[PDB]
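Repro case for the chain-ordering regression, as requested:
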Amino acid sequence: MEVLYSLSKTLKDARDKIVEGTLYSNVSDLIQQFNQMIVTMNGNDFQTGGIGNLPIRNWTFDFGLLGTTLLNLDANYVETARTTIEYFIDFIDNVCMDEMVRESQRNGVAPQSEALRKLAGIKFKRINFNNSSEYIENWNLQNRRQRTGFVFHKPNIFPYSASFTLNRSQPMHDNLMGTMWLNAGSEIQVAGFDYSCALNAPANIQQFEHIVQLRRALTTATITLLPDAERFSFPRVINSADGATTWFFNPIILRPNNVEVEFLLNGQIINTYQARFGTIVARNFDTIRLSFQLMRPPNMTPAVNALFPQAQPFQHHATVGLTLRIESAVCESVLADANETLLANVTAVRQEYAIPVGPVFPPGMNWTELITNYSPSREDNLQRVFTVASIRSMLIK
Amino acid sequence: MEVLYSLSKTLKDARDKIVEGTLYSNVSDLIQQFNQMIVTMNGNDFQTGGIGNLPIRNWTFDFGLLGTTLLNLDANYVETARTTIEYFIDFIDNVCMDEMVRESQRNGVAPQSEALRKLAGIKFKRINFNNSSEYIENWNLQNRRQRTGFVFHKPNIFPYSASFTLNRSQPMHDNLMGTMWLNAGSEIQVAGFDYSCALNAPANIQQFEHIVQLRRALTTATITLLPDAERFSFPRVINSADGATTWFFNPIILRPNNVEVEFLLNGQIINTYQARFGTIVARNFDTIRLSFQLMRPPNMTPAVNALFPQAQPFQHHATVGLTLRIESAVCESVLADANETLLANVTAVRQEYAIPVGPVFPPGMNWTELITNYSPSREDNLQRVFTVASIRSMLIK
Amino acid sequence: MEVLYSLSKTLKDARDKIVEGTLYSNVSDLIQQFNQMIVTMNGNDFQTGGIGNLPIRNWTFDFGLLGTTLLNLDANYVETARTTIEYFIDFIDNVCMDEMVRESQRNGVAPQSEALRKLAGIKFKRINFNNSSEYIENWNLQNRRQRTGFVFHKPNIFPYSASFTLNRSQPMHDNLMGTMWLNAGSEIQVAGFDYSCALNAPANIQQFEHIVQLRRALTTATITLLPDAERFSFPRVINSADGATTWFFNPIILRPNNVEVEFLLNGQIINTYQARFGTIVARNFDTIRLSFQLMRPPNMTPAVNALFPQAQPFQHHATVGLTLRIESAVCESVLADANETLLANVTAVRQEYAIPVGPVFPPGMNWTELITNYSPSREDNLQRVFTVASIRSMLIK
Amino acid sequence: MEVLYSLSKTLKDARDKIVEGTLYSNVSDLIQQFNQMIVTMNGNDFQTGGIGNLPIRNWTFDFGLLGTTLLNLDANYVETARTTIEYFIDFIDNVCMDEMVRESQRNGVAPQSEALRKLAGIKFKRINFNNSSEYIENWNLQNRRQRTGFVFHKPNIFPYSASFTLNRSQPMHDNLMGTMWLNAGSEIQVAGFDYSCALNAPANIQQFEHIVQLRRALTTATITLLPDAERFSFPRVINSADGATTWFFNPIILRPNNVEVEFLLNGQIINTYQARFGTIVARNFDTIRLSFQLMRPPNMTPAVNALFPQAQPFQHHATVGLTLRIESAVCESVLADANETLLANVTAVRQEYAIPVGPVFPPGMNWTELITNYSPSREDNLQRVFTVASIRSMLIK
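-- result from build under test --
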C-alpha cells in the first residue's frame, strides 16, 4: 500500500512538474524516481476487478525510460511523459477502485486485491517514494505501533439518534418530565423539559443529565457550547414510547442554570466547565456528561406567572436546552468529516458497481450504522479503504 | 497564466527557502530557477493597470543573478535576494490584480491584461516551474480537455431564495396548504404545511414535493439530512403572493413520514434514500427531489386532539420539515466556498478600485445572480479570475 | 483516436488511389505512408468486442510491404494491395463499432475499447496522416481547446414538444385565450388564439408571447419566418390541461400584426426583427422570443361580422400564427442534423447488437431526451461517438 | 482575392497536415508552400479595420521558417508551427471581416479594404496555392470570363410575397373569384378560388393562371410539384386590397384538373408538364407559368351539393391549389441557401460592428430587398463578399 501511495504521488508530481519549458534541474530527481518506477513495473502483468459490475481489466507494462540528455524540457519530452502518465493514472484509479470494494472480516489491514498484493510484493519496494500525506503517515505509524492521529474539522463522531426519555409520564400524557436529545454528526442538542415547571420537585430545581458515549476518544477538541437547544424549542406532537399514541409538547424556554459539562475518559474527569458557554476545549475524552437544571423563577411577572399555574392543566411546558458542537478535534482513529470526501468516494465506488453486501460494513455503508458498532475489524477495514480512497483522490477528482 | 503561476510559485519558494544560514543543498534547484527567471525577464517592460482607479505602473527588470560558490547562505545573499524578491512580488501582485479586474464577452479563458498577454508569449516559456496548486492543475487539465475537479466545503451552490407555494388557498387565508422553502448557499430547508392537518386527504396523508435543480453537477457529495426545518418551525406573518395582504402562520411540527430524497442526474434516478436521516452520499446529481408526507396521527392524545379539530378555524397549522446541508462535494467548475477566499479576493479587488460593471459579471459580483445565471462565458471568466486570485493569494494575504 | 482517423483515411486513400495503370508518382507518398502503417502495426495483436452481442475478435498483423521500384502500377500490385486493405478495413470497422457501443460517465472524452486505448499508445503516433474532416479537426481543436464549430443543415436542436397554455379558461372551455406550439427538429410553429377575437382586450389588441430556450447557443443561423402556422390552423379537439375533458378548437386565422422576433443570448438582445418575414439571420443566440398580436378587424364585411359576435356563443375562434424554420446553423457542440447520418449510424450500431443501457445516454439513443438534458458528460460522449461514426462512414456505408 | 484564398487554404492545410508524428513525405510540399508564404509575407506592414466599430489593428510579420530534413514530425515542430498559425489565422479573419463590410457602386469586384488591395500586388503572387473550392473556381472562371455555376440546395430565389388578385369582386366581398399566392424562399403555394364553384363559368370551368418571374435564370432545377396548396386550404379573414374592410374566406378543396406548368426562358416555352406531379425538371428557365382549372363536379352527392348551391349566399368557397418547391438548382449568379452560411456570415459581420449603410446593399442585408432589386453591380458586390465569407469559413466557424 505504501507502493500504491508512492505510485500515485510520483504520477501526481510528474503531471505537475514535467511541463513544457521547465528546467531539467527542477525535475532531475523526479525523473530518477519515474525511471525507477518504469523499470520496476516493466515486463509485468496485472489483473484488476472482478467483483460486482466493476469490469475485468488486464494491464501490461512496457514503456521507455524518460531521457536525461536534455537541458530544458520541450514538447517531445512532455508528450512522451504524458502518454505514459495517462496510462499509469488509469491503472492507479482502477487499482484503488478495486481495493476499495474488497472486504475482509479477518485481517482487514492486510491488502486485498491480488493485483495490489503483487504490488505489495518484494520487488516493488524500490518504488517507495515518500509517505507525506496524513493518511499514509498514520498508516505507517500504525503498521509500526505508534501514536497515530487525524485532525478533523467537524467529525461525525456521534451516531445519528433523535430520541427522548420520560422520567415522569401518564397515559394521558398531560404531565410529563424528561429529556429530548439529538446527536448528529458533530452536533448535540439536549432539552430537559418539565410540564409542572418544578413545583412538586424539591427546592423548585429539577436536575437533568445527559450522557453521550463516544465510540472513540477525541483529543484537543475545540467545542462550542451554547444554551437554548433550537430544535427542541418549538411546539411538536411526538409519538409515544411505542407509537401507540401521540403527545403534545409546547416549550417555554427557561435559562438552564448551573449547567456543568464534564468530559470523561474511562470515568476520570479529564475536564469540567461550570456555566461557561462559548468556545471551550476538551483535552482528551470519550464521554460527555451534560448536567443542567430547570429552576423555577422565584420572582415572576404576571405574564410568566399566568404561564406557570399550580393546578393540573399545564398549557405551557417549561424547557431548558443546551447545544454543543465539536468544531474541530484530533482523533486517533479514522472518521468521516466535513473537510474531506473519503467516505463519499468509498461509498460512491461501492454504489457504482452494486457491490454485494460484505461481512463487516453495513449495507450501503450507512455511516450511522457503521459508527454505532465500530468493532476493531470494522475499524481496520475502514482505515484501509479510507487510505486507498485518499490515494485515489490524490489524482481522480 | 501558467507562467504567472510559476513566477508566483518561485517567488514564494524564494521567500521561504532562501533564509540566512540555510545550506546551499536546500536551495540549489530554486536558485537555478530564480537565475533563469532573472535572465529571461531582464530587459523587458510591462505596463500594468489602466482601468478604473487601478494606477498605471511601469515595470522594468534589471536584476543580477545569484551566487553558487557558497556553502551556507549569509546576509549578503539574503539581502540581494530580498531586494529582488520584493520587486517581483509587487509586480506579480499588480499583474494579478490587472488580470482580475478585466472581463471579456467572447474568449473568456484566453488572457486579458496586456502584461499577462505578453507573458503568454513564446519568449517566457522557460519560467514554468511546477503547476502544483489545485486551481492551476485544474487550469491545465481543462486547457487540454481532461477530467477536472474542485473539492469544496459547504459549496454555496444554491442561489438564495426564500419563498412558498400554496396548493390550496383563499383570500381569508384560514385553511391553507402548501410548502415553504429556503435555499441558501449549501442548505435547503423545506417545510410542507397543512392547516387542516390532512383532514380530508386520501388516507389522511398530504404529499409534498420540492424539486431543486443545481446549476452544476456535484460529484461525490456528502450531505447531512435531518428533519424539522428550523426556520419554518415558528409563528410568522407572511405576505400574500401578490403582496396585497398578510396571513398568519402558526406551525406545530409533526414529523415527516415515508420521506424520500432522490438525487437525480439528467432525469434518471441516481440515488434514493428512504426515511434514512444523517450523513448520506450522492454520487452525481443535477437535481434533488425531496418528497415527504404529512400524516394525521391516528391515535391522538386529548391535547393534540384539541389542537386538530374538524371545524373551520384551525387555530394551529400542522407542518412537516426537512433540512439538507451539502457538507462537502466536488464540482467540475469553480464555486464559492466557506473555506476558500477566492470570491472575496476578487470582489474586494473590484471594490477597492471601483471597476465599472463589466460585460459579463453582475454588479458587485453578487453570487446570487452569478450562480442563478451561469452561462459558459461567465463560467470561463470566473475560472480565469479565480485562478488568478489563487495565484495572488499564494504570495499576498 | 486521431490515430484511428488516420488509419481510416489512409485505408480509404489506398483503396481510392492504388489503381491499376496509375503512375507511381501519384502514389509514392501514399505507398510511403502505407509502409509506415504496416511496419507500425506489424506484430501488434489487438482484441475487439466483448459487449452486448458484439463478437469477440482477435486481430493480428504480419503484412509485407508494397513495391517501390515499379514505374507504373499493374494488376498483381493492386490485388496484393487490396488483399491487405480489405483486412485493414475490417479491423478498423470492428474497432469503430466497439468504440461507439461503449460509453463512460466519467472522463468520456478518453478512449474506451481496449483496441483503441492501445492505439492511443506511443508506438502508433507515426500513423498520423492528417486531420481534414470537420469532425476530426473540431476534435483536435477542442482537445487543444480553441474556438470550434460544426455547421449543420436544419438541426434538430429543439426537442419534440407539442403543447399549449391557456391564459383565459373555463371548466366548460367555451371562451379561451392562449397559445399553442409545436417545437420539432428545426421548426417552431406557434399560434396564439382568442375565442372572443379580442373583444374585451385593451383596444381590441391581444398580445401573445412565446419563449423557446435553445439548450446550446447557435451561431450565424439562417432562419425562415412565415405567418399562419399551419398545424394549429384547422379544427381540432384537444385534451384538457390535466387530461380529464376535451375542448373543441375551430380556428379562423387573422393576420399577426406588429410581429417581433428577438434573438437573445443570456438576456443579451442580440437581434430584433420586427415586421419582417422570409429569410433572416440570427448572428448568435440562445433563446428565441417570439411576440405577435391579435388585432380585431376594425371594419368588417357582414360575413366576418357574423363570424365574430358580441354575444357568448363564439362558434368560430380567431387565431394568429407564426412558423420559424432554422435552415442552417453553426453550433459549438455537436448536434444531429438532416444532412449527415452520424446519429443514425450510432443508433444502428447499438440496436444491431443489443447493447444494454449505459450510464449517460438514454435508452435507444432517444434524441429527444438526449437533447432535453444535454449535460457536459453526455455532450462529450456524443462527440466521441459521432467522431468515431464519421471515421467509420469514411470506409463502411 | 486569389492570394487571400491561398492564405486560408494553406493555413487550413497547415492546421491539418502538420500534426505530431506525420511523415515528412506527407507534408513536404505543404512545408515548402508555408515557407513561401512566410518569406513573401515577411516585413510587410498591413492595416485592418477602421469602419464602423472594427478596431484599427496593424499586422507585422517576421516569423521563422519550418524544418526540412526531419524524416518524421514531432511535437516541438508542431508547436512552433502552431504559434505561427494562430497569428496568421487571426490576420486572415480580420482581413476577411474588413473586406466583407466594404461596398462600391463602381467596380464592385475589385478589392476594397486596402489590406486586400495590397495583397493583390505582384509581390504576393508567389503565395497562390491552388483555387479548388467552388467559389474560388467560379471566381477565376468568371474573371477570365467563362461559364460558371453554383449548385444550390433550396435556393431562395423568390422574394417573400404573400398576396392575392381578385378577378371577381364586390363592395361586400361576398362572391369573389381569383388567386392567392405565397412566393417565399424556394416555395410557391398558389391557390385559385371561386365562391360560385365555377357555377356560371363556361362549361363550369374557371381558369386560373399565375406567372412567377425569377430575378435570375436557374439551370437544371429539380422541382417538387404537388396539388392542394396546404397554406390556403383553411378559413381566413383577409383585409381588402384597399384596406378598408375585411373579407371572409372558407375553402373547400377541389383538386386542380389539367394543371399545366410551363418553365420559360426569354419567352420561349423551354419546358411544359401537364397533369404531372412529384419531381420534375426545368433544364433552363426564368419564369414559371402555372395554369390550373377549377371544374365543378358534374356528379355530386347530396352533402357536397348542399355545399355548392345555385343560389347567392355561397357559405363555402371552392379552391384549387398547387405547391411547387425548387428542391435544387444551378444558377449563374450567387444566391442564399439552406445549405451555406455565407449570407449569414456577411450579415453577422456587418451587424456585430454596425457598419454604416452603404451605397449598394440594402440596410441590414435583408434578402427580400436584396433579391427584389438585384442589379449587376449589386450582384458583383454580393459575389465578392460571399467569396470572402467562404474564404473565412475555411478557418473560422
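Ordering looks correct now. Residues 225 and 278 of chain A are 5 Å apart (CA to CA).
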